[PDB]
Scaffold this motif. Structure first.
Motif, PDB file in Angstrom:
ATOM      1  N   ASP A 174       0.805  -1.213   0.000  1.00 19.96           N
ATOM      2  CA  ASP A 174       0.000   0.000   0.000  1.00 19.96           C
ATOM      3  C   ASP A 174       0.844   1.271   0.000  1.00 19.96           C
ATOM      4  OD1 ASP A 174       0.996  -0.061   2.562  1.00 19.96           O
ATOM      5  OD2 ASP A 174      -0.942   0.093   3.570  1.00 19.96           O
ATOM      6  N   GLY A 175       2.165   1.150  -0.139  1.00 21.94           N
ATOM      7  CA  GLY A 175       3.036   2.297  -0.284  1.00 21.94           C
ATOM      8  C   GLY A 175       3.654   2.824   0.995  1.00 21.94           C
ATOM      9  N   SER A 176       3.192   2.378   2.159  1.00 21.40           N
ATOM     10  CA  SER A 176       3.723   2.892   3.413  1.00 21.40           C
ATOM     11  C   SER A 176       5.103   2.307   3.699  1.00 21.40           C
ATOM     12  CB  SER A 176       2.766   2.580   4.565  1.00 21.40           C
ATOM     13  OG  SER A 176       2.405   1.212   4.569  1.00 21.40           O
ATOM     14  N   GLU A 177       5.912   3.074   4.425  1.00 24.74           N
ATOM     15  CA  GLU A 177       7.288   2.675   4.694  1.00 24.74           C
ATOM     16  C   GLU A 177       7.345   1.549   5.719  1.00 24.74           C
ATOM     17  OE1 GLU A 177       9.882   3.584   3.133  1.00 24.74           O
ATOM     18  OE2 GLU A 177       9.481   5.526   2.198  1.00 24.74           O
ATOM     19  N   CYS A 178       8.231   0.583   5.472  1.00 28.73           N
ATOM     20  CA  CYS A 178       8.440  -0.524   6.397  1.00 28.73           C
ATOM     21  C   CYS A 178       9.530  -0.243   7.418  1.00 28.73           C
ATOM     22  CB  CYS A 178       8.800  -1.800   5.633  1.00 28.73           C
ATOM     23  SG  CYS A 178       7.444  -2.564   4.733  1.00 28.73           S
ATOM     24  N   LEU A 179      10.499   0.600   7.075  1.00 27.52           N
ATOM     25  CA  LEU A 179      11.642   0.862   7.927  1.00 27.52           C
ATOM     26  C   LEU A 179      11.649   2.317   8.378  1.00 27.52           C
ATOM     27  CD1 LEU A 179      14.210  -0.997   5.671  1.00 27.52           C
ATOM     28  CD2 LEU A 179      13.226  -1.871   7.801  1.00 27.52           C
ATOM     29  N   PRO A 180      12.100   2.590   9.598  1.00 21.84           N
ATOM     30  CA  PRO A 180      12.148   3.973  10.072  1.00 21.84           C
ATOM     31  C   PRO A 180      13.322   4.730   9.478  1.00 21.84           C
ATOM     32  CG  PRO A 180      13.072   2.538  11.730  1.00 21.84           C
ATOM     33  CD  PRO A 180      12.576   1.639  10.619  1.00 21.84           C
ATOM     34  N   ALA A 181      13.134   6.040   9.338  1.00 20.66           N
ATOM     35  CA  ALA A 181      14.227   6.902   8.920  1.00 20.66           C
ATOM     36  C   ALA A 181      15.358   6.840   9.941  1.00 20.66           C
ATOM     37  CB  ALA A 181      13.740   8.343   8.755  1.00 20.66           C
ATOM     38  N   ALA A 182      16.581   7.011   9.453  1.00 22.94           N
ATOM     39  CA  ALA A 182      17.745   6.935  10.322  1.00 22.94           C
ATOM     40  C   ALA A 182      17.691   8.045  11.366  1.00 22.94           C
ATOM     41  CB  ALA A 182      19.031   7.042   9.505  1.00 22.94           C
ATOM     42  N   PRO A 183      17.846   7.727  12.651  1.00 20.76           N
ATOM     43  CA  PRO A 183      17.907   8.778  13.672  1.00 20.76           C
ATOM     44  C   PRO A 183      19.084   9.710  13.430  1.00 20.76           C
ATOM     45  CG  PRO A 183      17.593   6.615  14.679  1.00 20.76           C
ATOM     46  CD  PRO A 183      17.915   6.377  13.233  1.00 20.76           C
ATOM     47  N   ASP A 184      18.986  10.905  14.012  1.00 23.34           N
ATOM     48  CA  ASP A 184      20.034  11.905  13.858  1.00 23.34           C
ATOM     49  C   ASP A 184      21.365  11.364  14.367  1.00 23.34           C
ATOM     50  OD1 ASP A 184      21.509  14.216  13.521  1.00 23.34           O
ATOM     51  OD2 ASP A 184      20.700  15.203  15.307  1.00 23.34           O
ATOM     52  N   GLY A 185      22.401  11.492  13.542  1.00 22.02           N
ATOM     53  CA  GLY A 185      23.728  11.053  13.908  1.00 22.02           C
ATOM     54  C   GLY A 185      24.069   9.628  13.534  1.00 22.02           C
ATOM     55  N   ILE A 186      23.146   8.892  12.923  1.00 22.83           N
ATOM     56  CA  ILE A 186      23.397   7.526  12.481  1.00 22.83           C
ATOM     57  C   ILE A 186      23.617   7.560  10.974  1.00 22.83           C
ATOM     58  CG2 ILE A 186      22.422   5.229  12.189  1.00 22.83           C
ATOM     59  CD1 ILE A 186      21.196   5.376  14.854  1.00 22.83           C
ATOM     60  N   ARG A 187      24.852   7.305  10.556  1.00 16.83           N
ATOM     61  CA  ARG A 187      25.246   7.295   9.156  1.00 16.83           C
ATOM     62  C   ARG A 187      25.615   5.881   8.729  1.00 16.83           C
ATOM     63  NH1 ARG A 187      27.135  11.304  12.096  1.00 16.83           N
ATOM     64  NH2 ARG A 187      28.816   9.877  12.728  1.00 16.83           N
ATOM     65  N   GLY A 188      25.797   5.711   7.423  1.00 15.18           N
ATOM     66  CA  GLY A 188      26.090   4.401   6.885  1.00 15.18           C
ATOM     67  C   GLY A 188      27.456   3.885   7.297  1.00 15.18           C
ATOM     68  N   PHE A 189      27.592   2.563   7.225  1.00 16.60           N
ATOM     69  CA  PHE A 189      28.865   1.913   7.502  1.00 16.60           C
ATOM     70  C   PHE A 189      29.940   2.482   6.579  1.00 16.60           C
ATOM     71  CE2 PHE A 189      31.949  -1.560   7.619  1.00 16.60           C
ATOM     72  CZ  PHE A 189      31.955  -1.875   8.965  1.00 16.60           C
ATOM     73  N   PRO A 190      31.102   2.874   7.109  1.00 19.66           N
ATOM     74  CA  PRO A 190      32.013   3.729   6.330  1.00 19.66           C
ATOM     75  C   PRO A 190      32.848   3.013   5.280  1.00 19.66           C
ATOM     76  CG  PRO A 190      32.920   3.336   8.503  1.00 19.66           C
ATOM     77  CD  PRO A 190      31.560   2.689   8.498  1.00 19.66           C
ATOM     78  N   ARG A 191      33.014   1.693   5.354  1.00 20.89           N
ATOM     79  CA  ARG A 191      33.884   0.970   4.424  1.00 20.89           C
ATOM     80  C   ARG A 191      33.130  -0.228   3.854  1.00 20.89           C
ATOM     81  NH1 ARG A 191      35.741   5.064   4.369  1.00 20.89           N
ATOM     82  NH2 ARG A 191      37.864   5.778   4.862  1.00 20.89           N
ATOM     83  N   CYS A 192      32.689  -0.104   2.603  1.00 22.69           N
ATOM     84  CA  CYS A 192      31.928  -1.150   1.928  1.00 22.69           C
ATOM     85  C   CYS A 192      32.437  -1.281   0.502  1.00 22.69           C
ATOM     86  CB  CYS A 192      30.431  -0.829   1.926  1.00 22.69           C
ATOM     87  SG  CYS A 192      29.687  -0.651   3.559  1.00 22.69           S
ATOM     88  N   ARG A 193      32.926  -2.471   0.144  1.00 20.35           N
ATOM     89  CA  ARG A 193      33.328  -2.706  -1.238  1.00 20.35           C
ATOM     90  C   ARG A 193      32.112  -2.791  -2.154  1.00 20.35           C
ATOM     91  NH1 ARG A 193      34.032  -2.093  -5.407  1.00 20.35           N
ATOM     92  NH2 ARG A 193      35.367  -3.104  -6.976  1.00 20.35           N
ATOM     93  N   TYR A 194      31.064  -3.483  -1.713  1.00 23.79           N
ATOM     94  CA  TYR A 194      29.823  -3.607  -2.464  1.00 23.79           C
ATOM     95  C   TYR A 194      28.656  -3.260  -1.553  1.00 23.79           C
ATOM     96  CZ  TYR A 194      32.870  -6.317  -5.546  1.00 23.79           C
ATOM     97  OH  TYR A 194      33.901  -6.727  -6.361  1.00 23.79           O
ATOM     98  N   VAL A 195      27.820  -2.324  -1.992  1.00 27.31           N
ATOM     99  CA  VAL A 195      26.609  -1.943  -1.275  1.00 27.31           C
ATOM    100  C   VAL A 195      25.427  -2.519  -2.040  1.00 27.31           C
ATOM    101  CG1 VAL A 195      25.156  -0.068  -0.459  1.00 27.31           C
ATOM    102  CG2 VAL A 195      27.643   0.131  -0.314  1.00 27.31           C
ATOM    103  N   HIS A 196      24.791  -3.537  -1.468  1.00 28.34           N
ATOM    104  CA  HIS A 196      23.623  -4.161  -2.083  1.00 28.34           C
ATOM    105  C   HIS A 196      22.393  -3.343  -1.707  1.00 28.34           C
ATOM    106  CE1 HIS A 196      26.750  -7.192  -1.768  1.00 28.34           C
ATOM    107  NE2 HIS A 196      26.157  -7.883  -2.725  1.00 28.34           N
TER     108      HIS A 196
END
Ligand SMILES: *[C@@H]1O[C@H](CO)[C@@H](O[C@@H]2O[C@H](CO)[C@@H](O[C@@H]3O[C@H](CO[C@H]4O[C@H](CO)[C@@H](O)[C@H](O)[C@@H]4O)[C@@H](O)[C@H](O)[C@@H]3O)[C@H](O)[C@H]2NC(C)=O)[C@H](O)[C@H]1NC(C)=O
Ligand SMILES: *[C@@H]1O[C@H](CO)[C@@H](O[C@@H]2O[C@H](CO)[C@@H](O[C@@H]3O[C@H](CO[C@H]4O[C@H](CO)[C@@H](O)[C@H](O)[C@@H]4O)[C@@H](O)[C@H](O)[C@@H]3O)[C@H](O)[C@H]2NC(C)=O)[C@H](O)[C@H]1NC(C)=O
Ligand SMILES: *[C@@H]1O[C@H](CO)[C@@H](O[C@@H]2O[C@H](CO)[C@@H](O[C@@H]3O[C@H](CO[C@H]4O[C@H](CO)[C@@H](O)[C@H](O)[C@@H]4O)[C@@H](O)[C@H](O)[C@@H]3O)[C@H](O)[C@H]2NC(C)=O)[C@H](O)[C@H]1NC(C)=O
Ligand SMILES: Fc1ccc([C@@H]2CCNC[C@H]2COc2ccc3c(c2)OCO3)cc1
Ligand SMILES: Fc1ccc([C@@H]2CCNC[C@H]2COc2ccc3c(c2)OCO3)cc1
Ligand SMILES: Fc1ccc([C@@H]2CCNC[C@H]2COc2ccc3c(c2)OCO3)cc1
Ligand SMILES: *[C@@H]1O[C@H](CO)[C@@H](O)[C@H](O)[C@H]1NC(C)=O
Ligand SMILES: *[C@@H]1O[C@H](CO)[C@@H](O)[C@H](O)[C@H]1NC(C)=O
Ligand SMILES: *[C@@H]1O[C@H](CO)[C@@H](O)[C@H](O)[C@H]1NC(C)=O
Ligand SMILES: *[C@@H]1O[C@H](CO)[C@@H](O)[C@H](O)[C@H]1NC(C)=O
Ligand SMILES: *[C@@H]1O[C@H](CO)[C@@H](O)[C@H](O)[C@H]1NC(C)=O
Ligand SMILES: *[C@@H]1O[C@H](CO)[C@@H](O)[C@H](O)[C@H]1NC(C)=O
Ligand SMILES: *[C@@H]1O[C@H](CO)[C@@H](O)[C@H](O)[C@H]1NC(C)=O
Ligand SMILES: *[C@@H]1O[C@H](CO)[C@@H](O)[C@H](O)[C@H]1NC(C)=O
Ligand SMILES: *[C@@H]1O[C@H](CO)[C@@H](O)[C@H](O)[C@H]1NC(C)=O
Ligand SMILES: *[C@@H]1O[C@H](CO)[C@@H](O)[C@H](O)[C@H]1NC(C)=O
Ligand SMILES: *[C@@H]1O[C@H](CO)[C@@H](O)[C@H](O)[C@H]1NC(C)=O
Ligand SMILES: *[C@@H]1O[C@H](CO)[C@@H](O)[C@H](O)[C@H]1NC(C)=O
Lengths: 251, 131, 131, 251, 131, 251
Positions: free
Chosen positions: D87-109
């Protein structure tokens, strides 16, 4: 290069971390440990709005950071910014919950206006902090009174009311090389601001305009320009009106 | 190191504000509902440049900024409140984090009064020697 | 206890990233306005399986999860930053939280050098005995 | 069952809390205490998207929790999810403030698609953590790159550039027994994904499709299926196109 | 000081709830995905007024409020989790924050067993005196 | 006036901070340090809704504060407020993230209604705390179950299922001298509440109304008034219906 710690030895302050401490140096409680904030005012920096704003700049990619401090210094000059982009969008973020204005300000320079704001947050170009209510931040929050300052950490040895005045300014091209400022007498009467103008001179000039009747008596904008003949260091150690938008000159 | 004020000016007087964390409460003033608002929780004081402390403080806070900013870059806490607590812990770890070798330079144990408790109580055997 | 890697595989090499919390700043790079963005604050290093440390680390983090998850269930902090500080405090409390009975097993006080300061300075009375 | 602490004795790592420590073991600073994150990759788990997603599930009633770590491991495989309900609604919450992606990834799936999402948050079914930028969480945040991992705590003794590649996937029935995945060549060209496909094989297959001209030349969707004849362990120790929606086969 | 319950009534029994921070996990119950919801993480117990502890606890929490409220007014943390950790640090600082003068009242070092290691090993020289 | 700390000496509890501690007093772990919350119930305060609400008041200018506690007491009476102003705006803030209701409540008095709410936050007039799930706050959050209580701090020596019942009330003039309360039998049947009514009496009266058929059989509101003839201390140590809006009397 760990965080320095202030300690008193031989009747003199000096840096000495917990590891450079002798056995005689005694720490009986966390009460002896204190974080304090000192104002850039006390080091002789120029505090006028044109000079102060040029120490701040916009930058993206750097997350803001906040550290608390327990004691601060009474400030003469504080700053409160409401800057938007020319398209109306806000340049500064709203103050996070629990971040209030700096508690002791003799003069609050409230600057409203526009600028390009080429950055997500506004930082201090010289690495200093923006001091709020017992919280120091690396960035400027919207409409929140702050003083420029730096933080120190101390090991203590065992051992005039509060008046505040708001000064309002209009700005164009904020945060650029070509920034123009106007001191606001009322919503229709303004004075072209220069770095030479002290807070006391702005309040006296504003009083003269009211007490002599030189406010705009139309619906249009009146901009007074002070001519360089009228002169105006550290705060702690101390006319004829002709009209020619509507520019004018005060001799 | 010793601090050397290298600023263009120094205000030798420090008009400060802080909070009396547990000041002698007056009746019901400690109750948040009855107590002062955010603007009225501050005490004030005035300090002068005795022993050059004020101009030293200004230079100290100035010189602290680089290390403090680098610490803030490396942390993921949005608001840091634990700097002084960790410095108190590091104070104890440098003195007591290992074995305290008595009479060593890194052991803050003084057996003074009580070396003079053994070396004077030798006289309970050496001349209490009645033969 | 000793750790026993019980995983299907082990990568014996650890290509790690971390932050130089206070690395030798280069000019103005410590100023947030001029310094690197969030992606460029990291240093890197490479560690090999000397003394089986890498495969031991992987099993250790694996075995830590249950206790860590149960600690997180019981706390109401949304983000926990104080685990290492509390472990430093508990280090000091187990050694110094009571009275240190010298020569006892739970007292980390070595009077070695200075037992040899009393037992050799006995010779200032026993044979400085000129009769 | 307190939190274990790693210490080095007799040239070997072992668990020993602050209370199981001998007087010779010395802790001079909090700098000797370190929290580290290790990737499930290093233990030999399957890292393909079909295998990795089955280790995650949705659950309500459990508040999310976050713990920080100071050092992490360079990852080969990371994951970034944009999952919605039908129905289009989001399943996952937006990232809280200060939470960024993992800094070292060879492949991001990067997986986008739909699923029932019968739960307020997505947890790791095996109790592991989702590792972000120096912060480990029990739940998955929307559109935020993470690596699967676990945390360790250590007492230290006193004593190739970074390339990243994004691989995009479409998903239906996410988080269920009947989940279908499609590797995205472009917005109109897709490949039916199987667990056998390695990241390097997907990039080579995607290059072959471009360099041979097998993208969809219409406005419709083109799904290539690799036949089982084309084969494809640990990452650290290492054709004819016919068309028959528009399914096809690559021999 | 000693506590004096000055409340109108006292419930001498304390039916309490808390969390088993690291209770013996049962299979997969430690995994958040499989474990209990927020309502089912609690253990319970019942305490009685032995040594007047329950009525003392109620008065203690009552008398703690003023100092606690004043501490909360002076802090800028929205949520305070560090009170007990700072009290543990202050415990160590009062005992070990200075030089420990042995046999002094503020030094918690007992040389008892080992004063009886010097004063009895004097008999290895005083009467091992074979002339 | 530092934060008192509970310690056991000579078979008796007493206050004694870390600095008033003798060398025999031993603290081997932070596990010996515990924060606990005790309910105002246990001191004999009146727990009925009319008496309890008068201990709370609205005030502006004071930022809310939160402190955690690790162990709490099973409560007989808890409170859950959904108060609006007469213009429909909310009087209480939504619960911050991670703040849940008090976990053990025999009776949850859910009060919905209106009041002037002359203040940004609702505080405890006697300085007590509002106890939530292992978090104590100085203010009341909207629709979140709390118990009134206070916090203690302890140094420990080294050394019946859970049933909950919701009781619903309507209120007018909340937080004033002229506050009226109604116990809700259903959406159309109400009883004028007085301080004398215990939770068990309200549930028995509500059962009598259902089991005898005295609910409103129209679309209008039915308010039963109990006459003073029907009587109703500490919780731990223990009719004819005539109709005359539609007021009535129960003899
Ligand atoms: C701690 O105290 C230090 C000393 O007071 C502060 O040093 C300041 O550092 C900033 C850089 O962050 C310098 O700003 C630069 O100034 C130069 C030169 O500006 C003009 O002034 C000189 C004479 O002083 C003049 O001869 C030149 O021609 C310039 O017209 C600019 O070129 C740079 O772009 C930059 O703006 C300050 O000059 C410097 N002050 C002093 C007194 O040396 C330091 O910032 C303090 N730390 C914190 C955190 O506040
Ligand atoms: C720490 O390391 C441990 C060892 O590597 C990890 O143990 C894993 O624990 C999970 C449960 O959380 C197990 O998953 C279960 O697997 C069984 C069986 O799966 C299939 O595999 C066996 C052969 O291995 C096969 O014979 C069976 O027929 C199955 O087809 C499932 O039935 C369960 O539903 C569940 O998925 C892992 O199998 C287990 N791995 C190993 C190698 O034992 C542990 O998870 C690690 N901890 C953390 C926090 O990551
Ligand atoms: C710790 O325990 C203390 C003792 O139980 C609590 O003391 C309470 O403090 C509040 C003030 O915050 C008092 O409330 C005041 O009460 C007076 C008098 O109220 C009526 O009662 C007397 C007889 O008791 C009657 O003679 C009078 O005529 C009144 O009709 C009011 O005038 C005030 O406005 C205010 O409401 C409590 O009375 C007092 N209780 C006791 C038993 O002394 C203290 O609050 C506790 N601390 C915490 C944090 O909970
Ligand atoms: F937080 C606290 C720090 C120090 C105290 C000291 C206690 C003894 N009497 C004098 C007080 C000095 O206060 C200071 C010192 C340096 C400062 C400051 C105030 O403002 C900015 O830089 C009180 C409170
Ligand atoms: F946060 C810090 C931890 C340890 C250091 C060490 C200091 C000495 N030189 C080698 C460093 C080892 O770094 C590690 C060890 C285990 C890890 C890891 C990196 O990533 C995941 O698991 C630096 C920073
Ligand atoms: F958080 C913790 C505190 C104390 C323990 C103790 C450990 C030994 N067995 C009895 C436990 C007593 O629990 C208490 C004491 C006072 C309280 C309370 C519960 O609720 C409100 O006031 C466990 C957990
Ligand atoms: C600002 O204007 C001046 C005009 O002399 C120019 O020299 C300078 O380059 C301008 N600043 C930038 C950032 O372009
Ligand atoms: C002056 O302008 C401000 C900003 O628009 C406005 O809020 C204020 O009411 C104005 N004052 C008068 C007297 O109109
Ligand atoms: C300017 O003068 C008028 C007249 O007294 C006064 O009301 C106003 O506050 C002054 N402005 C400022 C910024 O002080
Ligand atoms: C009318 O406006 C002029 C400025 O254009 C001002 O100087 C003058 O005092 C005003 N006249 C009166 C009567 O206020
Ligand atoms: C998923 O589908 C399989 C088909 O064999 C079925 O056995 C299994 O029960 C399904 N899963 C659930 C949770 O129903
Ligand atoms: C591919 O699809 C994504 C998602 O809708 C869109 O953002 C992107 O622009 C598309 N690319 C092209 C080349 O159309
Ligand atoms: C697929 O190949 C094209 C052609 O070079 C390239 O531009 C694109 O980035 C490739 N896709 C991925 C995911 O690498
Ligand atoms: C047209 O599409 C087919 C797939 O249906 C593709 O294989 C073929 O290469 C395309 N032709 C050209 C000229 O690109
Ligand atoms: C509430 O009403 C009573 C009626 O007797 C009055 O005496 C009292 O002053 C009122 N409260 C306030 C705050 O006005
Ligand atoms: C009673 O009123 C509440 C609040 O409006 C409503 O949610 C509930 O559905 C009502 N119950 C019935 C049986 O109508
Ligand atoms: C009132 O009685 C009815 C009838 O049994 C019951 O369903 C309802 O829950 C009761 N109300 C309360 C608040 O217990
Ligand atoms: C109708 O309503 C009255 C209250 O006005 C109530 O007492 C009576 O029992 C109801 N009658 C029936 C048959 O339910």
């Amino acid at each position: 290069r760990s965080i320095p710690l202030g300690v008193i030895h031989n009747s003199a302050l000096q840096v000495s971390d917990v590891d450079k401490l002798v056995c005689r140096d005694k720490l009986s409680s966390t009460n002896q440990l204190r974080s304090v904030g000192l104002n850039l005012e006390g080091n002789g920096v120029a505090t006028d709005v044109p000079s102060a704003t040029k120490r701040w700049g916009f930058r993206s990619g750097v997350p803001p950071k906040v550290v608390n401090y327990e004691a601060g210094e009474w400030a003469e000059n504080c700053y409160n910014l409401e800057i938007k982009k020319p398209d109306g969008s806000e340049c500064l973020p709203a103050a996070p919950d629990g971040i209030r204005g700096f508690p002791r300000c003799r003069y609050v320079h409230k600057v409203s206006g526009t600028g390009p704001c080429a950055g997500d947050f506004a930082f201090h170009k010289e690495g200093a902090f923006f001091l709020y209510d017992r919280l120091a931040s690396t960035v400027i929050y919207r409409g929140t009174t702050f003083a420029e300052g730096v933080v120190a950490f101390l090991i203590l040895p065992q051992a005039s009311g509060y008046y505040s005045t708001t000064i309002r300014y209009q700005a164009t091209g904020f945060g650029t090389n070509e920034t123009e400022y106007l001191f606001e007498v009322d919503n229709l009467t303004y004075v072209q601001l220069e770095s030479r103008f002290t807070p006391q001179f702005l309040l006296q000039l504003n009083e003269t305009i009211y007490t002599s009747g030189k406010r705009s008596n139309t619906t249009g904008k009146l901009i007074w320009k002070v001519n360089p003949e009228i002169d105006t260091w550290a705060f702690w150690e101390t006319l004829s009106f002709t009209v020619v938008x509507x520019x004018x000159x005060x001799x | 190191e010793a601090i050397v004020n290298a600023q263009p000016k120094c205000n030798p007087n420090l008009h400060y504000w802080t909070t009396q964390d547990e000041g002698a409460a007056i009746g019901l003033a400690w109750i948040p509902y009855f107590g002062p608002a955010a603007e009225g929780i501050y005490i004030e004081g005035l300090m002068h440049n005795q022993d050059g402390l004020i101009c030293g403080l200004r230079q100290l806070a100035n010189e602290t900024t680089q290390a403090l900013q680098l610490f803030l870059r490396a942390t993921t806490e949005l608001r840091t409140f634990s700097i002084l607590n960790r410095k108190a812990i590091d104070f104890l770890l440098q003195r007591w984090g290992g074995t305290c070798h008595i009479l060593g330079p890194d052991c803050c144990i003084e057996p003074a009064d009580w070396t003079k408790n053994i070396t004077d109580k030798i006289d309970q055997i050496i001349h209490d020697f009645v033969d």
